[PDB]
Structures are given as structure tokens and as C-alpha cells.
Amino acid sequence: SISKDSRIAIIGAGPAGLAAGMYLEQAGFHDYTILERTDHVGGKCHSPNYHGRRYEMGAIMGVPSYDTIQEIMDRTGDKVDGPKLRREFLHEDGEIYVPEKDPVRGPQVMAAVQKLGQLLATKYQGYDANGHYNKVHEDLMLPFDEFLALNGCEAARDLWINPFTAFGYGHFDNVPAAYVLKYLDFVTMMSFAKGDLWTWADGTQAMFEHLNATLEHPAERNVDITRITREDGKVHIHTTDWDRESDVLVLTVPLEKFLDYSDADDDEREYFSKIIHQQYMVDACLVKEYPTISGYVPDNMRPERLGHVMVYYHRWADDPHQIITTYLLRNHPDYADKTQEECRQMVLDDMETFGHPVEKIIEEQTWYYFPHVSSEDYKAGWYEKVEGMQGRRNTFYAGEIMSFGNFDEVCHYSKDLVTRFFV
Numbered sequence: 001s002i003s004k005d006s007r008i009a010i011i012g013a014g015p016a017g018l019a020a021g022m023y024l025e026q027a028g029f030h031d032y033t034i035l036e037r038t039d040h041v042g043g044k045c046h047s048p049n050y051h052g053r054r055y056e057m058g059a060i061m062g063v064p065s066y067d068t069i070q071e072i073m074d075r076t077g078d079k080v081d082g083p084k085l086r087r088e089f090l091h092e093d094g095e096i097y098v099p100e101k102d103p104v105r106g107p108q109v110m111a112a113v114q115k116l117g118q119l120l121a122t123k124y125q126g127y128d129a130n131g132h133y134n135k136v137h138e139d140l141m142l143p144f145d146e147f148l149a150l151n152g153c154e155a156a157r158d159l160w161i162n163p164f165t166a167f168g169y170g171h172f173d174n175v176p177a178a179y180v181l182k183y184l185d186f187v188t189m190m191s192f193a194k195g196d197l198w199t200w201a202d203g204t205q206a207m208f209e210h211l212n213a214t215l216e217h218p219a220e221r222n223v224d225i226t227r228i229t230r231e232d233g234k235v236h237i238h239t240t241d242w243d244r245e246s247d248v249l250v251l252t253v254p255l256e257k258f259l260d261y262s263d264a265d266d267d268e269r270e271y272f273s274k275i276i277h278q279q280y281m282v283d284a285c286l287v288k289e290y291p292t293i294s295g296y297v298p299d300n301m302r303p304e305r306l307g308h309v310m311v312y313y314h315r316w317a318d319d320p321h322q323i324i325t326t327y328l329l330r331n332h333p334d335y336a337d338k339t340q341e342e343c344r345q346m347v348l349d350d351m352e353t354f355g356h357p358v359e360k361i362i363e364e365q366t367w368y369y370f371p372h373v374s375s376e377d378y379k380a381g382w383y384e385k386v387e388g389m390q391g392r393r394n395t396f397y398a399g400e401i402m403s404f405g406n407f408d409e410v411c412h413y414s415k416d417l418v419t420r421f422f423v
């Protein structure tokens with residue numbers, strides 16, 4: 001437990017940091033400060049304007065099991081009121097097909113899925129807990145495909161891959177199953193499969209903008225932190241405009257990047273240096289032959305097709321001159337990084353192939369996405385080490401790396417961090 005008059009400095013005004021403020025405030029910790037580097041809040045929930053409506057450069061959707069996000073909507077008064085999500089499936093040559101009608105693959109998938117469901121509910125009980133401080137089963141530390149191979153459920157990858165690889169989280173040849181299954185737990189997977197998906201008319205960013213406004217201390221923006229030191233039981237935060245002292249540090253920003261403006265200790269340097277991330281690239285496009293529906297391309301989710309468009313988003317049904325966003329990955333451990341130029345050429349070429357040629361790209365973003373560690377690093381005890389450092393020199397660790405790269409997970413983690421260490 002931590003004293004209620006502690007001065008608590010929260011770095012980052014994305015969901016993770018905003019929720020930290022919310023839940024600290026609600027537990028009676030009123031002397032918090034959220035420091036944001038940019039001029040805006042919401043982080044990767046980023047919904048800019050175009051032609052009188054908001055489009056999504058980052059996060060788009062949620063599922064009914066997003067309980068922490070419902071608590072936030074309860075507080076802001078926002079509602080799930082966005083346009084309905086609908087999808088078709090394309091081959092890499094633009095051909096529309098329906099995977100579940102595949103007479104060989106169809107049955108293999110449903111048998112694997114059913115078998116996995118049973119395994120998850122028994123053998124792997126506890127897998128779905130938020131965070132990684134409850135040590136998961138050792139099998140879950142293997143790359144997702146190996147985890148499946150071991151259990152004779154390879155064909156379950158067909159259902160899990162679409163809202164995972166296409167959604168920027170990487171490839172099953174290497175991403176530890178622990179991550180896959182805390183995000184796509186059986187319930188969430190079934191919700192997605194069923195199309196039971198939340199969206200917001202004013203963008204996922206809106207509820208975070210409004211959360212910020214409801215906070216007793218809305219974020220301080222445009223804060224360029226040049227150095228943080230932690231001597232004598234205090235946190236000294238140096239910025240370009242001021243430097244100040246706190247009692248507690250909550251990190252919701254990238255931890256490898258933290259090493260560069262901090263008095264990082266040996267463990268912090270050793271362990272945070274192992275963090276790897278996804279280079280997930282979005283392009284906001286105007287197109288001819290406006291799609292009628294969103295399109296996924298399982299062929300382009302293969303590592304051999306890295307940099308190609310894996311999915312694209314049909315948001316506003318009624319205006320053929322509104323924004324269609326495309327999604328691609330620029331990195332894989334077995335491959336050298338694809339350049340943004342070569343990938344932007346693939347956006348144009350792929351969309352042309354799909355029959356929805358691009359007339360214009362008006363915004364582009366490669367995001368710092370899904371920070372995580374390797375299976376080898378997971379197995380070697382990365383989370384036991386880092387969770388065991390919680391509170392060392394009044395510093396706490398949070399955000400995506402500590403849970404999973406989605407807004408419900410990071411908010412959930414921020415909620416429990418207060419329960420775990422402060423209350």
C-alpha cells in the first residue's frame with residue numbers, strides 16, 4: 001500500500017495512463033499528474049476528422065467482454081454507437097472466397113477450435129488472466145503454432161489469425177501463445193467470429209478525450225522529459241520547461257525508450273533491452289470503386305507476404321469519397337524490415353488488385369505497436385523478473401508490454417495496479 005498524499009507522476013496520456021489517473025482518483029489518490037509528450041490524448045486511439053466525420057488511424061473496435069472500457073464509458077457517458085463491422089475474404093489476387101465452405105479445411109478448423117476450447121477450459125486454466133504475473137503454463141510460452149502443434153490443433157490458426165496477424169500483432173511462427181490467448185481468449189474469439197463487435201461514431205479516441213476531461217487532473221500535454229532520476233526515495237523529473245519532484249512513478253510508455261532518458265538500473269537496462277515491437281502501418285485512403293464491405297486477405301498474412309495489405313476498413317457505408325484505411329506489417333524476426341516506401345507502393349498495388357484502387361493517401365502512420373518479448377525470453381522468466389521489480393525506487397511498470405497491445409487490456413492492468421500496490 002501507498003500513502004494517499006503521495007505525489008504520483010504518470011508518464012503517458014494514452015488509455016493506460018488515463019485509466020491509471022481514473023483508478024487512482026477513484027481510490028482516493030488525488031495528487032497525481034499525467035505527463036504527455038504530444039499535444040493530444042488517447043495515444044493509439046487516434047480518430048482524426050475528414051469531411052465532417054471521424055476516421056480511425058489507430059484503434060477501432062471492442063467486444064462485450066471489455067468490462068474496464070464499460071466502466072470508462074459509464075464515467076464519460078459515451079455509448080457504443082459506431083457503424084456495424086462486416087467482412088469478406090480475399091485471396092492475394094483479389095478473389096472473393098468464403099473459407100468455411102472449404103470441404104477439407106472447414107471440418108479440420110471446427111474440430112481444432114472445439115478441441116482447443118476444451119483444452120483452454122481445463123489443461124490451461126488461468127491462461128486468460130490479465131497480465132503475466134500469474135505464471136502461465138509452460139506450453140503457453142511457446143510460439144502460438146508450436147502450442148497448437150503440441151495439442152494437435154494446428155487448424156485453429158485459421159480462425160485465430162485474422163483478428164491477430166492482420167491486426168498487426170505478428171505471426172504465429174514466433175509470437176508466444178501467452179499473448180495470443182490473453183487477447184483472443186475463447187469468449188473474445190467467439191465474439192469476433194459472431195461479429196459481436198463494438199465501434200464508436202466519434203472514434204475510439206473520443207471516450208479517452210472525454211475521460212481526460214472528467215479527471216480531476218487532466219493531462220499536462222507537450223511535456224518534453226529530458227531526464228528522470230530516482231535518488232533518496234524520490235522521483236526527479238526534468239523537462240525543457242520545468243523540473244519537479246514526485247514520490248511515485250507510474251510508467252505507461254515504452255520501457256526500452258525509457259532507458260534513454262532515465263537513470264535505468266542494470267536490471268532495467270538488461271530486461272527492457274529485450275523488448276521487441278511491431279511496425280504496423282496504416283494508410284488513410286481515398287479510393288475509386290468504393291468497397292461495400294471490409295476485406296481480409298489471409299494469403300497476405302503469411303510471413304512470405306510481409307508488407308502487403310492484410311485487411312482494409314470500410315467505415316462509412318454512405319459516402320464513397322470517405323476514408324478507407326489499409327493495414328500492413330513491416331517487420332518479422334526472420335526478415336529484414338520493409339521500408340515505408342516499398343510498403344506504400346504495395347498499398348497502391350494491392351488495392352488495385354482488390355478492385356478498389358487508391359486515388360489518394362491523405363494520412364499515414366507507422367505505429368509503435370504490440371511491444372512484447374520472444375518465446376525464449378518469456379520462458380527464461382522475463383515477467384517474473386520485471387513484475388518482481390514493481391515498486392523498486394518507487395517506480396511502477398504498466399502499459400502494453402505488461403499486458404497486451406489492446407486498450408481494454410492496458411486499462412484493465414492499470415485498474416489492477418492500483419488494487420495491487422496502492423490501495
Ligand SMILES: Cc1cc2nc3c(=O)[nH]c(=O)nc-3n(C[C@H](O)[C@H](O)[C@H](O)COP(=O)(O)OP(=O)(O)OC[C@H]3O[C@@H](n4cnc5c(N)ncnc54)[C@H](O)[C@@H]3O)c2cc1C
Pocket residue numbers: 011012013014015016017035036037038040041042043044045057058059060061062223225252253254280282367369399400404405406407408410
Ligand atoms: C492501427 C491500430 C489499430 C488498433 N485497433 C485496436 C482495436 O480495434 N481494439 C483495441 O482494443 N486496441 C486496438 N489498438 C491497440 C490500442 O490502441 C493500444 O493497445 C492502446 O492504445 C495502448 O494504450 P497505451 O496507453 O498502453 O499506449 P499508447 O496508446 O501507445 O499511448 C502511450 C502514450 O504515451 C505517450 N508517450 C510516449 N512516449 C512518451 C514520453 N517519453 N513522455 C511522455 N509521453 C510519452 C504517447 O504520446 C501516448 O499518448 C490498435 C492500435 C493501432 C495502432
Ligand SMILES: CC\C=C/C=C/C=C/CCCCCCCCCC(=O)O
Pocket residue numbers: 060061062063085086087166167168294311312313314327406
Ligand atoms: C476486439 C478487438 C481488439 C483488438 C484489435 C486490434 C487491432 C485492430 C487493427 C485493425 C483492424 C482492421 C479493421 C478491419 C475491419 C474489420 C471489420 C470486420 O472484420 O468485420
